[PDB]
Amino acid sequence: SDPSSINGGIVVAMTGKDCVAIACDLRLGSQSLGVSNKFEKIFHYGHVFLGITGLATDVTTLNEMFRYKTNLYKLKEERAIEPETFTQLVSSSLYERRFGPYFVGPVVAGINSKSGKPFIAGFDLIGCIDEAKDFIVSGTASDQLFGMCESLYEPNLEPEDLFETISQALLNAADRDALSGWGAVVYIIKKDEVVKRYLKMRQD
Amino acid sequence: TGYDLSNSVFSPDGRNFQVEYAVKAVENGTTSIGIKCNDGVVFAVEKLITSKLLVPQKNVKIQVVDRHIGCVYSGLIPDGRHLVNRGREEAASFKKLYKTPIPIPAFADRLGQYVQAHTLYNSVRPFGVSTIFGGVDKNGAHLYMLEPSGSYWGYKGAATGKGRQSAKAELEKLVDHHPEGLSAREAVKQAAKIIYLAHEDNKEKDFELEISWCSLSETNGLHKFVKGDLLQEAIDFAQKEIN
Amino acid sequence: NNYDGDTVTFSPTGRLFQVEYALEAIKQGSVTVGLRSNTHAVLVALKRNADELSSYQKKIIKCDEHMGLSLAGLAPDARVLSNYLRQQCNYSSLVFNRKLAVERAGHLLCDKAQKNTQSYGGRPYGVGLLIIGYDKSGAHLLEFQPSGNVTELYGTAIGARSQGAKTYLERTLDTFIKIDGNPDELIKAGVEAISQSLRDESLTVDNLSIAIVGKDTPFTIYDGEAVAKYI
Amino acid sequence: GYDRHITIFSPEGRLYQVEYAFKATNQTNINSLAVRGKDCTVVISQKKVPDKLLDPTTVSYIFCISRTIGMVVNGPIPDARNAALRAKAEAAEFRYKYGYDMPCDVLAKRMANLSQIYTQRAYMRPLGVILTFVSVDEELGPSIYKTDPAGYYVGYKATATGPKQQEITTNLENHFKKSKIDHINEESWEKVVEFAITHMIDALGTEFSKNDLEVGVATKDKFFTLSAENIEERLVAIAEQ
Amino acid sequence: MTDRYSFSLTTFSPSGKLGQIDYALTAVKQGVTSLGIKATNGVVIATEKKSSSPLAMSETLSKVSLLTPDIGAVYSGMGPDYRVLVDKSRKVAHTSYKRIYGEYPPTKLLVSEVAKIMQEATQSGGVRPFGVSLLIAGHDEFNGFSLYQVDPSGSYFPWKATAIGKGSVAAKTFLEKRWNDELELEDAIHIALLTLKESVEGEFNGDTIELAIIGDENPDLLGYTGIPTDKGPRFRKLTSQEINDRLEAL
Amino acid sequence: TTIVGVKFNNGVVIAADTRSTQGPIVADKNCAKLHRISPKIWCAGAGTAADTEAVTQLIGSNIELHSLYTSREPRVVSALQMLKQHLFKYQGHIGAYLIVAGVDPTGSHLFSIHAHGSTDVGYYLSLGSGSLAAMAVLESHWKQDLTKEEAIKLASDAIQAGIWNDLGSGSNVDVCVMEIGKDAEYLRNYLTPNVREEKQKSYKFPRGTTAVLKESIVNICDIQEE
Amino acid sequence: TSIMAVTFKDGVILGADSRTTTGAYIANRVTDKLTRVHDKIWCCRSGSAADTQAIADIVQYHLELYTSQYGTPSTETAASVFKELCYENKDNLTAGIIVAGYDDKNKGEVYTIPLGGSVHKLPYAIAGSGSTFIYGYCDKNFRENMSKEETVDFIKHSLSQAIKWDGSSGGVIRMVVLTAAGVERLIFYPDEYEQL
Amino acid sequence: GSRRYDSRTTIFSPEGRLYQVEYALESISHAGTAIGIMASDGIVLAAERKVTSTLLEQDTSTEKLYKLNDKIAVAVAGLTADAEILINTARIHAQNYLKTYNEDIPVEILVRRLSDIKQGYTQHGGLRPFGVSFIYAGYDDRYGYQLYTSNPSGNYTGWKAISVGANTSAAQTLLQMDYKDDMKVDDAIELALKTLSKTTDSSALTYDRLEFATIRKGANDGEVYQKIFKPQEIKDILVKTGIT
Numbered sequence A: 001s002d003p004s005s006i007n008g009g010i011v012v013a014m015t016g017k018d019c020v021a022i023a024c025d026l027r028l029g030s031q032s033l034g035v036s037n038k039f040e041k042i043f044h045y046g047h048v049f050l051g052i053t054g055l056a057t058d059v060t061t062l063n064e065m066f067r068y069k070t071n072l073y074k075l076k077e078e079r080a081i082e083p084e085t086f087t088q089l090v091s092s093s094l095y096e097r098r099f100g101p102y103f104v105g106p107v108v109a110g111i112n113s114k115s116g117k118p119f120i121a122g123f124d125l126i127g128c129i130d131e132a133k134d135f136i137v138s139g140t141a142s143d144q145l146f147g148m149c150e151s152l153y154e155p156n157l158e159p160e161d162l163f164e165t166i167s168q169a170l171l172n173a174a175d176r177d178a179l180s181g182w183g184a185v186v187y188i189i190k191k192d193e194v195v196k197r198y199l200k201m202r203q204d
Numbered sequence B: 001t002g003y004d005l006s007n008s009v010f011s012p013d014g015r016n017f018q019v020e021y022a023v024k025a026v027e028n029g030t031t032s033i034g035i036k037c038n039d040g041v042v043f044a045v046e047k048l049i050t051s052k053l054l055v056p057q058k059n060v061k062i063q064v065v066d067r068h069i070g071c072v073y074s075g076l077i078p079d080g081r082h083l084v085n086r087g088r089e090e091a092a093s094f095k096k097l098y099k100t101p102i103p104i105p106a107f108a109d110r111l112g113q114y115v116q117a118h119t120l121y122n123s124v125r126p127f128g129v130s131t132i133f134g135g136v137d138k139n140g141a142h143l144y145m146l147e148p149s150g151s152y153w154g155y156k157g158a159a160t161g162k163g164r165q166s167a168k169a170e171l172e173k174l175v176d177h178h179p180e181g182l183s184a185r186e187a188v189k190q191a192a193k194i195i196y197l198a199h200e201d202n203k204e205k206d207f208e209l210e211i212s213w214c215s216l217s218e219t220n221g222l223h224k225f226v227k228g229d230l231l232q233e234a235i236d237f238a239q240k241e242i243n
Numbered sequence C: 001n002n003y004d005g006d007t008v009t010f011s012p013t014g015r016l017f018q019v020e021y022a023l024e025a026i027k028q029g030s031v032t033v034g035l036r037s038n039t040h041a042v043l044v045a046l047k048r049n050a051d052e053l054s055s056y057q058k059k060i061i062k063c064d065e066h067m068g069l070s071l072a073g074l075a076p077d078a079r080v081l082s083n084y085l086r087q088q089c090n091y092s093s094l095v096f097n098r099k100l101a102v103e104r105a106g107h108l109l110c111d112k113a114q115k116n117t118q119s120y121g122g123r124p125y126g127v128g129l130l131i132i133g134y135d136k137s138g139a140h141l142l143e144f145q146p147s148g149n150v151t152e153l154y155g156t157a158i159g160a161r162s163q164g165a166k167t168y169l170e171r172t173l174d175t176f177i178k179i180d181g182n183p184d185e186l187i188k189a190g191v192e193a194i195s196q197s198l199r200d201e202s203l204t205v206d207n208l209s210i211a212i213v214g215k216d217t218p219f220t221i222y223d224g225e226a227v228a229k230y231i
Numbered sequence D: 001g002y003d004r005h006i007t008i009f010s011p012e013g014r015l016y017q018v019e020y021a022f023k024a025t026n027q028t029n030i031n032s033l034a035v036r037g038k039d040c041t042v043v044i045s046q047k048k049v050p051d052k053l054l055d056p057t058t059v060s061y062i063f064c065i066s067r068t069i070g071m072v073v074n075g076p077i078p079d080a081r082n083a084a085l086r087a088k089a090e091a092a093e094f095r096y097k098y099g100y101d102m103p104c105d106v107l108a109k110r111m112a113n114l115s116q117i118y119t120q121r122a123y124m125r126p127l128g129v130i131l132t133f134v135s136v137d138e139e140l141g142p143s144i145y146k147t148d149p150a151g152y153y154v155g156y157k158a159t160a161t162g163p164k165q166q167e168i169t170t171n172l173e174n175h176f177k178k179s180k181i182d183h184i185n186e187e188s189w190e191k192v193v194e195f196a197i198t199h200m201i202d203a204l205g206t207e208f209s210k211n212d213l214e215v216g217v218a219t220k221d222k223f224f225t226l227s228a229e230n231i232e233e234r235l236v237a238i239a240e241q
Numbered sequence E: 001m002t003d004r005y006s007f008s009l010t011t012f013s014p015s016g017k018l019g020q021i022d023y024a025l026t027a028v029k030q031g032v033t034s035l036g037i038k039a040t041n042g043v044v045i046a047t048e049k050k051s052s053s054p055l056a057m058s059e060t061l062s063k064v065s066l067l068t069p070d071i072g073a074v075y076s077g078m079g080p081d082y083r084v085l086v087d088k089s090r091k092v093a094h095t096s097y098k099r100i101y102g103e104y105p106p107t108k109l110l111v112s113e114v115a116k117i118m119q120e121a122t123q124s125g126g127v128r129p130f131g132v133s134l135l136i137a138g139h140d141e142f143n144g145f146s147l148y149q150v151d152p153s154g155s156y157f158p159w160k161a162t163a164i165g166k167g168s169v170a171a172k173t174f175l176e177k178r179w180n181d182e183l184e185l186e187d188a189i190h191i192a193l194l195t196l197k198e199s200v201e202g203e204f205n206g207d208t209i210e211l212a213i214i215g216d217e218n219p220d221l222l223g224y225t226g227i228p229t230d231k232g233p234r235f236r237k238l239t240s241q242e243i244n245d246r247l248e249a250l
Numbered sequence F: 001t002t003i004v005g006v007k008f009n010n011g012v013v014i015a016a017d018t019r020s021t022q023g024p025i026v027a028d029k030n031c032a033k034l035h036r037i038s039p040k041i042w043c044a045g046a047g048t049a050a051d052t053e054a055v056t057q058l059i060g061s062n063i064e065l066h067s068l069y070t071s072r073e074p075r076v077v078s079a080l081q082m083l084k085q086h087l088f089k090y091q092g093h094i095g096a097y098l099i100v101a102g103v104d105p106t107g108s109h110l111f112s113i114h115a116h117g118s119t120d121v122g123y124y125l126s127l128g129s130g131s132l133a134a135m136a137v138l139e140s141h142w143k144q145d146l147t148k149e150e151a152i153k154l155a156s157d158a159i160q161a162g163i164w165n166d167l168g169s170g171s172n173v174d175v176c177v178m179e180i181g182k183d184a185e186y187l188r189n190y191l192t193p194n195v196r197e198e199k200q201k202s203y204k205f206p207r208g209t210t211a212v213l214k215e216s217i218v219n220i221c222d223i224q225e226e
Numbered sequence G: 001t002s003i004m005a006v007t008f009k010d011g012v013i014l015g016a017d018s019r020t021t022t023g024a025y026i027a028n029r030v031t032d033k034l035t036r037v038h039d040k041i042w043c044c045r046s047g048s049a050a051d052t053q054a055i056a057d058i059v060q061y062h063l064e065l066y067t068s069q070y071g072t073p074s075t076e077t078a079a080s081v082f083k084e085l086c087y088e089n090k091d092n093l094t095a096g097i098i099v100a101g102y103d104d105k106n107k108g109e110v111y112t113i114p115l116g117g118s119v120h121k122l123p124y125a126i127a128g129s130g131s132t133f134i135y136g137y138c139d140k141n142f143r144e145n146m147s148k149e150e151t152v153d154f155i156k157h158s159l160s161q162a163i164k165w166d167g168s169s170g171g172v173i174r175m176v177v178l179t180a181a182g183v184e185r186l187i188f189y190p191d192e193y194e195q196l
Numbered sequence H: 001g002s003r004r005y006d007s008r009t010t011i012f013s014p015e016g017r018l019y020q021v022e023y024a025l026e027s028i029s030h031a032g033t034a035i036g037i038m039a040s041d042g043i044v045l046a047a048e049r050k051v052t053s054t055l056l057e058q059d060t061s062t063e064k065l066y067k068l069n070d071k072i073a074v075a076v077a078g079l080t081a082d083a084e085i086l087i088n089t090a091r092i093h094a095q096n097y098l099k100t101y102n103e104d105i106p107v108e109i110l111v112r113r114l115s116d117i118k119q120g121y122t123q124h125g126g127l128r129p130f131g132v133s134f135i136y137a138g139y140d141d142r143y144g145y146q147l148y149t150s151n152p153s154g155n156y157t158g159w160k161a162i163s164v165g166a167n168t169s170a171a172q173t174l175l176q177m178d179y180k181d182d183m184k185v186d187d188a189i190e191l192a193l194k195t196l197s198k199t200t201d202s203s204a205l206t207y208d209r210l211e212f213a214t215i216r217k218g219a220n221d222g223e224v225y226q227k228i229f230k231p232q233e234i235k236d237i238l239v240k241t242g243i244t
């Protein structure tokens, strides 16, 4: 009944020293029934990364929408969109459906190509921007993720250390949520290289 | 040239020839007048008897708007009816929102703006009538005359149609000889005379006289037609003056 | 000349040529006569045929139990206007339980025709109408012109050669007005009136069309052998 | 030659319908003048009642647009009243939407934009009027802003409009060359009206009775027109010195 | 009523010419001279305040207009057309960009939107083209400083320096000799004043000349403090006094 | 949420806490509730966060266009009128509860706005879940003819009362001062009385602690030449 | 809310408390419920604050536009504009408004417009939640053609009692006097009216 | 009424021609020449800017060559403002297709859509047609490298080598002479520039008077790269081919 918890899933993002990390689980289900273990929730438009939790049809629809808009942006602007600008575009796009909203929890992550500054942001389903310094959480295990992040996180972590922190935050949060898990992906993002890692986790 | 072929086009003079051509239709029409009196107004019109087959006192020309405004016009009769229909809508919406009956100056502008709007586009034709109208409101008696251009002013006496010059001359005498004012019953008598005197311009066919009036004392500020004995009294007075 | 291309254009002398051209279509139409007394009102119409194989075009249309008209000019325009009258008569009955006054019916036709003479794109109606009726103020006869001008009359005629019938009625004015409580004699006067507009052709059984309305007489149309009595 | 019938460009880059609308402006044969005082803005205009049958009280080309804004028109009365009604509606709407009284210059711009649209859109004709707006603005003080059929508008130290505008304009120009200030240095509005009438008399070379003039005065928080008796008092003061 | 002009008033003639656009350009030719020069660290735009009357207060009429905090515009041709275009240009900068991306548009894209509006008046029903040519100077983070011309057709071109209106042919020749890629903003202002003096007949001073720049950020003109990333508008209109100071070193 | 507005001698000050919540969870610890409508017109927002942001941006955008159209600095009553009519039209469904303040050519002003579109005038105002705690402080310590220094102190104290006593409010105090004839100063994190203590332990993991299945480079660059 | 308007010899006086409540919390203790729609046409507002403000703002706009075209409107005209808004939007509005004004021709007039959007011209009118507690008092103590001082005392005593018994009413007693002389604002504080 | 001033932009002549389309083509014949040449391993787009100035900022300028998506580009001949209206519509159409089918739009489908829009203005609406002719250069996995052209009539055709704008008669004769089917991109680049150099109304062909672009599979492995040439890069290729 509750659109935000039919399919399940989670996304978490973290900042480090000259780097950002964004991670998600791979589950898509129909309430109790597990359907797919390959449903990735993180997408990217140029160097800007977008994770989306919530209703899976809206996750797909919004990805297609932001691909659409970022492609037109690039043709007209003659440059890739930046995380700060994309964050505003997500907010604008969500608020135009104020009284008929997409049932999603988006999370933006990336590094500004000009300033080199790490950037993360979270949103509610109607467009409100949460621009945190430390971390952003989203999905059916958001309580769990808040608890993990708030204890495990420390500032200025190196890329390879940040990977361990965000991975443990996701895994242990997912294992306390029935509608999350079934695999996980972690993106480590630096100014001009991005590494993608699939995590080994319990499959129940 | 070609400036006169389309409405709302300025000629090199700065003139709208289509409106000036509408005036020619007004000048071709029968004579109609208005007289402002002490506590009201009087309207009168010339009705040409084209044939014996016309039923007397049936083809009424003067029209009422709301219950306190009288309207008469010269030129294209249907255009005048269209304008009065609009006037009635304007008066109804005013009374609907503001409760009080529409003041005469307020009513005058409603017609004025509507007629003026028909000089703004080539997709419409100007009105082929000059309308004399007025009545009694909270501030007293008012008489107006409205032209095809949308131009209107307040008047002490007004006249239009084929016998307007003759009528205007007669109205000017009344203004000079009665600075303190004219009574309602006097104005009806004078109105009858002026129409009869103005009939010399349409002397081929005989005519029928039609008079109406609004007066604070005589009609309680409501528009009424002059009928029966009071009408005959005015006709007798008029017939006596021409002889 | 240069000012007759559309209805939205006055001429330099203040004339509307498209309206005048519409008026011309009536003069080409077949003659029809209207007259009334105090009790009854009568329409008489000379129907026109295309040829000997063709039927005679109907001229008279019923609008209500107490009202109807005869046409001269473009017949389809008479159908549009008569349909409008039917609706207006019908609105008066359904909403106010009130038979529509003949004078008010004329006012409604005037205003409908007027809108077509002041707006761009449209055209004036190309037909003249003679409306008869019996309402709360007795018998009535109206003449409609597509300029918008509607006139209440004792008697009249419109169409080709209508001047002859109109003169006759102007002489007979004092006689036929007094024909009260006698429908047949009032029709006789109407048939004799329309006869003054005839040349070459005469009134035959399928040529003549008569209608009547009165005090205790609903609007009824007579055609065929029903009018042989009056020939 | 249909480029002279509607508002499209001629080969010279001109809009003839706009130019002919400017010529309609002088059809009334009336001259108007506007000047600024310290605390006030005064506008005067010739009043001509040729017909004896006219009610002279109703013959006017000055309009009370809002409590603060007044407007005098040069041009035919139908177009004048069209512009007046619109300005009143715009001024009222502005107050409702934005919570404060519409400034004189802002109304002038709005009406000028509407006029511009008629010069660009074919189905709408220009209005054959010049609109002179006057007020004492709460920010800018005494204000005179004038609009024309081209959609042009600008603020003024003083201005004149009509058939004999140039004679009045030069007369005013020469005064401000002497005083070297942007206004009439005078405390009371009564004396500013006297200045306005005096300089119109000198420029036109005609004397005025009480019924030959029409006067509008803008002060802080209200605009008002003078009666025939108020003008008479003004004419007496001029004659006595 | 109804707008029954649903057809184009600008059409191709047998020779392939769009008459109304050509005639609009002729109206621009009659217009007062305006110019723009681009420097390394700024842009300057300038024009003559041709006062219609000495009684008229020429300060109230603004020929040079702020569109965004970092973009300005000047014109040659019909003033009223320019005024409404500025209103539409300011609005479209918000509706089609700022309300979407949370930031002001880059110069080229705002120019593109203005160009679109002018193109539509060349093709849409019942309208004539705008009788103006615009010069739009602006700055943005990724493109730096830029200067654009926009014509009645809707066509726009980027310029290092240019002039439009009355004496544009002579003014463009004058700019070709003086312009180089190492000009500082003050040097461009100096050249702008020299170029503009040639086309002006009468008085030449701060009160008869209108001049604005796109240059350094002006935190003093921002109106508030407390946000480091907001450093103020790059658009600044030069005062009457500031112009006269540079006319002494002329 | 605790937001307040306090008038003083030569202007007006507004303040706000920085906590955003979704149910019993804190969504953002350092949320920015002071919004700029125009350079010298600022407003604090309570209720639905997206709504307070959106309605402020929209009116702020139209206020800017209005300022350019009229060649005048914007007025607080204009922002007030545009906000109330927008909110009234949406019949309270746009959940924005605002304290609108500013200085303009008319003077200094302070208003409140509720979601259904009703406005109120006052020398001191408070909105949000912590408004009762804040209003208790304002009603106890407010006086006429406050100085700039006293008004900031009173405003921040009112927010603190919300921070400590209302569970819907917390973290930091944001302030904006708008004085007549001066630039408005936005004091982001004016007070910071809720810094988290040092943790007992570092939870930095040894590298290789997490089990990995696959690795790959992600192509973020465009299609390449040659 | 406790509001009233009372006609008297020299004109009319409007009166109101200053309390706005959200349930039992007093959201505003110094509210001004006496609002101006024209120079000498004012109204007392009760019910929804948002609704009555929106209505009053629209009426002020209508009367400002009326004045520009037709000159000063009558109090009856102002009441009719209120009625039109209240009647036609009755399903969506909660507004109890008393309209009071001073003409020179008609002198002091009072029109009350309850929830349904009906209009009632009365010598005096009372409305709002607190009015219930003073129907007895006001009916017994009202006289026609009172003096200014008597009318002020009548309103002060009436609203004092309404405030005393109604939880939704309180604060200061505001009053607006409408006469030929002009417009006068009066205020009365708790210490004054409670001891009555 | 308004009928008086209607030019009637969508009617036939007695000969069965569309007046406005024909006159729009006459306009385009005065525009700067644009050439497209399709090779086995890529496509070339070359175009001449019209009588430029030394004070024109070239490196930020774009009047001829526009990008529709990553796979498709166009060369413009005619009114630039008209072209940009259509270009933005085409960009949107490509994105609509990508959103719907999750695949890049086939070149012909994009071309047909734009060509249909142009057709509409010749048959209904009473508006003037777009005074624009396009050369479409694009790639998809069905037909590979493709060249198309469209004109104000809304008619489109496929080409191996084609020119639009000024001196197309002379240009097409030269292309028809030297073009061969087994030709490569580097050779096509040379042919395009040589053809412009002979047909140009200017005294000499220089880097500042040109816009140039290629669509190559010359991208790292199975994919397509669009290269819009910079002023310095156009200057280098002019020296390489031996024109300057």
Ligand SMILES: *[B]([O])([O])[C]([C][C]([C])[C])[N]C(=O)[C]([C]C1=[C][C]=[C][C]=[C]1)[N]C(=O)C1=[C]N=[C][C]=N1
Pocket: A123, A124, A128, F001, F002, F019, F020, F021, F022, F023, F027, F031, F033, F045, F046, F047, F048, F049, F050, F052, F095, F128, F129, F168
């Ligand atoms: B405060 O409590 O009024 C605060 C002020 C806001 C402008 C930052 N509001 C909130 O924190 C609201 C509470 C709320 C929850 C649910 C529905 C409506 C209101 N929170 C949010 O708007 C919110 C919650 N989670 C994410 C983003 N925004």
Ligand SMILES: *[B]([O])([O])[C]([C][C]([C])[C])[N]C(=O)[C]([C]C1=[C][C]=[C][C]=[C]1)[N]C(=O)C1=[C]N=[C][C]=N1
Pocket: F114, F118, G001, G002, G019, G020, G021, G022, G027, G031, G033, G045, G046, G047, G048, G049, G050, G052, G128, G129, G168, G169
């Ligand atoms: B009064 O109590 O009717 C009062 C009059 C209002 C115009 C200021 N109304 C209110 O206080 C209403 C609630 C109410 C109470 C009693 C009867 C009817 C209605 N309050 C509000 O409208 C309100 C409260 N808080 C914020 C915004 N609006």
Ligand SMILES: [Cl-]
Pocket: D109, D110, D113, D114
């Ligand atoms: Cl506008």
Ligand SMILES: [Cl-]
Pocket: F119, G031, G032, G033, G049, G053
């Ligand atoms: Cl209230």
Ligand SMILES: [Mg+2]
Pocket: A174, A175, A176, A177, A178, A179, A180, A181, A182, A204
């Ligand atoms: Mg699990």
Ligand SMILES: [Mg+2]
Pocket: A203, A204
């Ligand atoms: Mg399981």
Ligand SMILES: [Mg+2]
Pocket: D006, D007, D117, D118, D119, D120, D121, D122, D123, D124, D125, D126
């Ligand atoms: Mg026009």
Ligand SMILES: [Mg+2]
Pocket: G162, G163, G164, G165, G166, G167, G168, G169, G170
């Ligand atoms: Mg109480």
